[PDB]
């Protein structure tokens, strides 16, 4: 949680573009900061970007190969649509280890997201009957 990381997280949250771009540029050359830092509330850059729905920021982050984790599930849970399209074509969990993307999508009615997942091809287990 160095001051450069705090400044960079604030830049991502507010929505400044040039600042985050040059920060990702100058981060690699020196290794003085980490792009995968964690907020005191457990919110890396990708999570907050997804929450605010900044598609350009999201793509920029993706291009520089940031760790994904349950970002797909986080985007599904918050009904963001285009982010799902971006996130498909590419150990403190939050959801129980028994949730697959189609299941969590079905939990929250969303015709678009469900129709997008189904075409890729998934299946849901049929539990044993008693």
């Amino acid at each position: 949680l160095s001051t450069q990381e705090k400044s960079y997280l604030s830049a991502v949250e507010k929505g400044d573009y040039a600042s985050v771009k040059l920060a990702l540029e100058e981060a690699e050359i020196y290794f003085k900061i980490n792009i995968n830092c964690i907020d005191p509330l457990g919110r890396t850059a990708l999570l907050i970007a997804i929450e605010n729905e900044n598609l350009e920021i999201i793509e920029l982050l993706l291009s520089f190969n940031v760790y994904v984790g349950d970002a797909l599930l986080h985007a599904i849970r918050k009904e963001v649509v285009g982010a799902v399209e971006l996130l498909l074509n590419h150990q403190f969990s939050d959801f129980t280890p028994d949730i697959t993307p189609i299941i969590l999508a079905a939990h929250t009615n969303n015709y678009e997201i469900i129709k997008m997942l189904v075409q890729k091809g998934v299946s849901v287990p049929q539990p044993h009957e008693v």
Partner: peptide, 22 residues
């Protein structure tokens, strides 16, 4: 969850315009 997005969009627009004019 709606107010936050609506505010940050304005903020980002402001940054873009201000930075692009200098």
């Amino acid at each position: 969850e709606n107010f936050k997005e609506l505010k940050q969009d304005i903020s980002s627009f402001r940054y873009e315009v201000i930075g692009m004019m200098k």
